[PDB]
């Protein structure tokens, strides 16, 4: 079952989102979104989208209904049927995505961090824990 | 132990991840954020789980003198058992996470830019020390 939780005060630099779970053996894609929260179909400071089906991990933002320029991570550090741990570390300059034991990609901010009011984790993924530190 | 230099220091949003095991005969181990490799160097953070006295002590040290100790709530470590600690450097302090829970927040005494070395030692067997 997905995760959706409010960050009504916003997230500050040095906020750490730790997500642990398992990629199902038949997974296509899942996502981690940091959103405006006002509703859904609204602005995304971070859309982190591992796609097992097309063998890519896409990063993007969305403002006023329009996607920005996609960034892609190096390789796919996820595997169908295998557990994973992701850290998303909010800094002053961007989001550091850590998967497993290594920094995976650094996504510089497009929206101010103060615009993040909701965390959503969904799609083809089984969640063990979503913690905000 | 683990002892590694930080060329450019640590910046806010640095995450230090430590995985290992407390040996069955442990007394104490520590995680230090120090200004340098020399003896008695200043410590921005001294994080000291003490199995022998059933406490977790945090402190700083400047010009040879320890500051006022802080103690964490309970001892989330046990002899013979593995552990995972996160130390998260922010602009306001060091957040210590043990297992699945925020454990203690240690507000900065020394400037963060003075941290140039990370040391993990004492009665601990390490699986991983990673800086993110
Ligand atoms: O940018 C992330 C979004 O991508 C959308 O599809 C992209 C696709 O990744 C790209 O190859 C090309 O076809 O442009 C499409 C539209 O931007 C997804 O539909 C959406 O879910 C996001 O993942
Ligand atoms: O503040 C950390 C240092 O504690 C020293 O031991 C203290 C002890 O915590 C206190 O209860 C009292 O007995 O004074 C002792 C000496 O200052 C340790 O010796 C030192 O290694 C640090 O951990």
Residue numbers in the entry:
A (entry chain A): 3 to 135
B (entry chain B): 4 to 135
From the manuscript:
pmcHuman galectins (GAL) are oligomeric β-galactosidase-binding lectins assembled from small (∼15 kDa) protomeric carbohydrate recognition domains (CRD). Among prototype galectins, galectin-7 (GAL-7) is recognized for its preferential expression profiles in normal epithelial cells. For example, while extracellular GAL-7 can trigger apoptosis of activated T cells following binding to glycoreceptors via its GBS, it can also bind E-cadherin on epithelial cells independently of its GBS. In this work, we studied the impact of homodimer interface mutations on the induction of Jurkat T cell apoptosis, allowing us to positively and negatively modulate the biological activity of GAL-7 by designing a covalent disulfide bridge (G16C) and destabilizing mutation (G16S) to control homodimer strength, stability, and biological activity.
To examine whether these functional changes are rooted in structural perturbations at the molecular level, we solved the X-ray structures of lactose-bound WT GAL-7 and that of variants G16C and G16S in their apo and holo states. In contrast, our omit maps clearly show the presence of a bound lactose molecule in the GBS of both protomers within the WT, G16C, and G16S complexes. However, since Arg71 is located at the crystal contact surface, this dissimilarity could easily be an artifact of crystal packing. Lactose positioning within the GBS also remains analogous for WT GAL-7 and G16X variants, preserving the vast majority of the previously described polar interactions. Our results show that α-lactose-binding affinities (KD) were found to be similar for WT GAL-7 and G16X variants. Closer thermodynamic investigation illustrates that although WT and G16C exhibit very similar entropic (ΔS) and enthalpic (ΔH) contributions to ligand binding, variant G16S shows significantly altered ΔH and ΔS contributions relative to the two more stable WT and G16C forms of the protein, in line with the lower stability observed in variant G16S. In comparison with holo WT, holo G16X structures also exhibit higher Cα B′-factor values in loop 1, especially for residues Ile13, Arg14, and Pro15, which are located near the site of mutation. Besides loop 1, holo structures of G16S and G16C exhibit increased conformational variations in residues 37–46 (loop 3) relative to WT, a structural element neighboring the GBS. In the presence of lactose, loop 5 Cα B′-factor values decrease in WT, while conversely increasing in G16X variants. The shortest pathway between the two G16S opposite GBSs also exhibits a similar weight value of 0.27 and involves the same sequence of residues, but transposed to the other protomer: N62(B)-F61(B)-Y106(B)-A104(B)-D103(B)-R20(A)-V88(A)-F50(A)-H49(A). These results suggest that the primary interaction network connecting the GBS of each protomer is conserved in G16X mutants, although transposed between the A and B protomers in G16S.
